[PDB]
Amino acid sequence: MKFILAEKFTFDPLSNTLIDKEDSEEIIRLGSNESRILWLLAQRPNEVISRNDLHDFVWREQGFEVDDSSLTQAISTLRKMLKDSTKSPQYVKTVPKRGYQLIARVETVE
DNA sequence: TCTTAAAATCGAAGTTAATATAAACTACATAACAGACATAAGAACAAGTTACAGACGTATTACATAAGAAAAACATAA
């Protein structure tokens, strides 16, 4: 099932591709970790998910354990490549002591 | 001017506490006493208002600590 974010971006959890409607010619390439994080965020529309729970769901299924700086770096790359605002709540933000939040709308293509 | 009648005086204090006999009836107007009512003064209960106090609740100020991000240094592979 393909998902649409904020009526602008399109992404699929199965092939890890990003398409911007403003520039449909340029496909945006994302890493597996950040793509899985964004898909986990999209699976729970617009409510807080824990850093601990999201981290353990993303990386223990991978079979290997990493430190918590990895999640922060992955989110930094996600915000940078999506060209989301540096600290304003436009698409993805961080809620301290509670976890991570998404603002972009969810539109399932199929 | 020589009798002769009036007039006046006669110690202080202290004490010193009443008497005491002797026409009737009628008519009228006025004052006084008693009862009741209304009025001015008074008291009690409740309400409005205007303010100040008392402790609680708000905003100004100075931070402790922990999560997140940037950066410098290090180890490793080409």
Side-chain angles (χ1 to χ4, degrees):
Chain A
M1 43 199 42
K2 199 170 293 292
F3 299 72
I4 305 175
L5 308 167
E7 297 281 358
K8 175 169 173 62
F9 294 131
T10 325
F11 162 68
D12 85 329
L14 303 179
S15 295
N16 165 347
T17 59
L18 201 78
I19 297 296
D20 179 20
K21 68 182 290 184
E22 182 192 8
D23 196 2
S24 181
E25 313 174 359
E26 182 194 3
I27 311 179
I28 272 286
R29 208 51 212 171
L30 284 176
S32 160
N33 290 304
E34 40 262 65
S35 295
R36 155 69 155 277
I37 290 163
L38 174 166
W39 168 49
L40 182 49
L41 270 167
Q43 274 171 305
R44 328 219 193 174
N46 272 267
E47 53 288 296
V48 53
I49 36 63
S50 173
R51 166 173 281 181
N52 184 31
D53 289 352
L54 166 154
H55 162 305
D56 61 49
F57 188 75
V58 156
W59 263 283
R60 274 89 170 102
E61 62 88 17
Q62 288 292 294
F64 44 85
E65 201 300 338
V66 287
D67 312 317
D68 278 42
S69 60
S70 79
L71 195 177
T72 299
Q73 177 85 0
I75 267 52
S76 153
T77 27
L78 187 162
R79 303 217 272 230
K80 171 65 173 53
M81 262 334 305
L82 268 71
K83 297 292 174 300
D84 179 31
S85 183
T86 64
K87 58 197 179 311
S88 296
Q90 294 298 109
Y91 299 140
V92 190
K93 68 180 178 67
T94 308
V95 58
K97 297 296 292 183
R98 270 312 297 145
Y100 273 73
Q101 208 62 232
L102 63 178
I103 296 71
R105 216 164 82 91
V106 174
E107 288 104 354
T108 300
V109 187
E110 186 163 347

